[PDB]
């Protein structure tokens, strides 16, 4: 009984490994060997966005590529205007502890969450010229870590109870729950077609989920430690993950294979957040060594360093237009690079 | 700039002023982080001074705010890396789970992101420990072989009126904890062991004095003295 099930699982894993080994014919580095390198890119801090009285955990660019919403432990959800460094709104929260933030594609709503296990929704473009709680999404067991909006009424939230969920704003209860993870889920990322999304947990594995079916599709495991953050390739057939192993990993969906390893001998510090570019050539990442590094997605070479922070960086974000980059760190100031 | 831009700048200035006022008001309170395990008197200690639970209290016109979260704390512990102190309670009476308590304390102390957060450590339920020592049913040497060769250090002067074996046991436990703390302390952050019981009411003064010493050390570091 139990022995037969274990043998069947072992055989399934063995045939998965055989299929994985058979699909790997030539390394991506060997194919893109005759590709001109992007060279060294040096980006300076165009404007610093000061005004936070405590450390910062999250940030998300808007669709218009002008508004940032930064989540900080001072109990505020300041909304910054990137062009003029203007604070559009100041949102005091019930709970100071925060590790996630979101911005609606329409720009009308913001979402926040932390150790209170509740995803607060604030409506910006409304009457009485104020930002107020719209829905206090509750029902999670573990701490909330990453939220991303699909529409103005549909959310995907990752919590600390090794599960993800898709919630409906109007209804107020979970539309669908996603379970199967064994480790703490630390991040979440969406896709341009808004049909599939990838999530990273603390069990050294990333997993793809379908918003419609509500069941897992693919599970990739190539990391030795927890995956702190994940970003998804703009094309829609790949993504990138970052762990505490001081290495990033670019996986692809169509092949179900690990493609490249991103690591350097000098760095030992882990990855906090990763982000891609509009074209997808450059893969951004943030490390514990109080700076960021720009790495090429095809060469795995250090293209430049963004050492503008004092403490280790928390979040990195790229605008929809790809014009600029935002890095929010625990130094209480988030910097804009271009 | 346009008139709308100037008005937006004025609004931003007012928002920044409100932010500064709120930050100044919030920074006046001293925040702590309470940790423990099962059969550890977190509830009795926190009620003595009375997803995430929080408490007020005040000592000598100084406000303290306490946070406790209700395994694998390696992730949410990153939130509390700017707090003034981490209180860690341990059940000194129970010997079965004392070793895993030592392991937990070692994981907390050597945590990479608590590299500058001092720890105030509480040996809760001292009367239960004294009763267990008096009974003699449970022996420390059964669990910790080094207790047999251990002796009470000189110049101790614990308190008036406890048996020498009780003092020996309590200082053996305290020496274990202090050795774990000072294995890689390097002087950036130190531990404050204390002997508290379930009925003791002077548990706020100990925390007040320990946090006062922590802030004194921080100020000494700030003036470049150390």
């Amino acid at each position, epitope marked *: 009984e139990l022995d037969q099930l274990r043998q069947e699982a072992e055989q399934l894993k063995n045939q998965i490994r055989d299929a994985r080994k058979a699909c790997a014919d030539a390394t991506l580095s060997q194919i893109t060997n005759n590709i001109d390198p992007v060279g060294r890119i040096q980006m300076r801090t165009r404007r610093t966005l000061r005004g936070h009285l405590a450390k910062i955990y999250a940030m998300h660019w808007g669709t218009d590529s002008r508004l940032l919403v930064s989540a900080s432990q001072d109990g505020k959800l300041i909304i910054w205007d990137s062009y003029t460094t203007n604070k559009v709104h100041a949102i005091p929260l019930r709970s100071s502890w925060v590790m996630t933030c979101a911005y609606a594609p329409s720009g009308n709503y913001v979402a926040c969450g932390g150790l209170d296990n509740i995803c607060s929704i604030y409506n910006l473009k409304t009457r009485e010229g104020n930002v107020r709680v719209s829905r206090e999404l509750a029902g999670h067991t573990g701490y909330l870590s990453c939220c991303r909006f699909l529409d103005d009424n549909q959310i995907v939230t990752s919590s600390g109870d090794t599960t993800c969920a898709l919630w409906d704003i109007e209804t107020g209860q979970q539309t669908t729950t996603f379970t199967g993870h064994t480790g703490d889920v630390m991040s979440l990322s969406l896709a341009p077609d808004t049909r599939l999304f990838v999530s990273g947990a603390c069990d050294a594995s990333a997993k793809l989920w379908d918003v419609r079916e509500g069941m897992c599709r693919q599970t990739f495991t190539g990391h030795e430690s927890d995956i702190n953050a994940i970003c998804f390739f703009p094309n829609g057939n790949a993504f990138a993950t970052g762990s505490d192993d001081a290495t990033c990993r670019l996986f692809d969906l169509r092949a179900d294979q690990e493609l490249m390893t991103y690591s350097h001998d000098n760095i030992i510090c882990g990855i906090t957040s990763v982000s891609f570019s509009k074209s997808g050539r450059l893969l951004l990442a943030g490390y514990d060594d109080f700076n960021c590094n720009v790495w090429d997605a095809l060469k795995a070479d250090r293209a430049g360093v963004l050492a503008g922070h004092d403490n280790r960086v928390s979040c990195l974000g790229v605008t929809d237009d790809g014009m600029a980059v935002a890095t929010g760190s625990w130094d209480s100031f988030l910097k804009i690079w271009n | 700039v346009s008139a709308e*831009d100037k008005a937006a700048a004025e609004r931003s200035k007012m928002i920044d002023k409100n932010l500064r006022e709120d930050g100044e008001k919030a920074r006046r309170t001293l925040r702590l982080l309470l940790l423990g395990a099962d059969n550890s008197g977190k509830s009795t200690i926190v009620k003595q001074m009375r997803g995430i639970f929080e408490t007020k209290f005040q000592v000598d016109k100084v406000n303290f705010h306490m946070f406790d979260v209700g395994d694998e704390r390696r992730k949410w512990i990153q939130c509390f890396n700017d707090v003034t102190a981490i209180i860690f309670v341990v059940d000194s009476s129970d010997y079965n789970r004392l070793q895993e308590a030592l392991n937990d304390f070692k994981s907390i102390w050597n945590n990479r992101w608590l590299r500058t957060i001092s720890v105030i450590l509480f040996l809760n339920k001292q009367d239960l420990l004294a009763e267990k020592v008096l009974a003699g049913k449970s022996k420390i040497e059964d669990y910790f072989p080094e207790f047999a060769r251990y002796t009470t250090p000189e110049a101790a002067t614990p308190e008036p009126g406890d048996d020498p074996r009780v003092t020996r046991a309590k200082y053996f436990i305290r020496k274990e904890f202090v050795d774990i703390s000072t294995a890689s302390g390097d002087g950036r952050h130190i531990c404050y062991p204390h002997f508290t019981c379930a009925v003791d009411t002077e548990n706020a003064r100990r925390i007040f004095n320990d946090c006062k010493d922590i802030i004194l050390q921080m100020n000494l570091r700030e003036y470049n003295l150390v």
Partner: single-chain antibody
Amino acid sequence: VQLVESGGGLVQPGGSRKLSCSASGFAFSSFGMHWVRQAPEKGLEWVAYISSGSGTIYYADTVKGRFTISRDDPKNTLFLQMTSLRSEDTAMYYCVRSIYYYGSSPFDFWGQGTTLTVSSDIVMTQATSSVPVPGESVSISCRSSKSLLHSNGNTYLYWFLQRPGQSPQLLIYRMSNLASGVPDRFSGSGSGTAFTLTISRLEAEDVGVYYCMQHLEYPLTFGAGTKLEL
């Protein structure tokens, strides 16, 4: 939200009068206040503006030196004090709330106005005064002395519609964005010193007076006004 103003009446020339406007349903402190005048037989003219927290107070050229404005946030009230008034100050007073940030809609709500009877600037031009017209597209053109386009790329002109016998409401701000509650039938475009407002499938309750108002720099100046008739 509600904004109601009280005061006014028959007053001898040269006297001092107080107009008090009270607000409910919204944060008065965040919003900035505007006092504007409507002559009984003429168009709208701006009078005064006060920012959030009374940080900046601006007055019109005509009323400079004899008009004072104040606001009491805890009481959610706005006071206007008038001294040495003239015979030209007899008009209807309108109080307007305006919020100022990126993507905001200034002049979104107009409070109920009062009536007072007494015993350089950018010029707005409206070529059409009365245009006969339901169900037919109507185009209204407004011209400015100088281009209302700043370096940042933001254009500053607002279109206001006046119903017969009550406060105006905003239709189009920045000549492109549509205010909340405005039907999609309204549309706006324009270029340097020439702005156009287009209405398609005109229906009932669209009769009113159209004003084009420039907000690039103070003092605020309103359009002459275009009347639409059946």
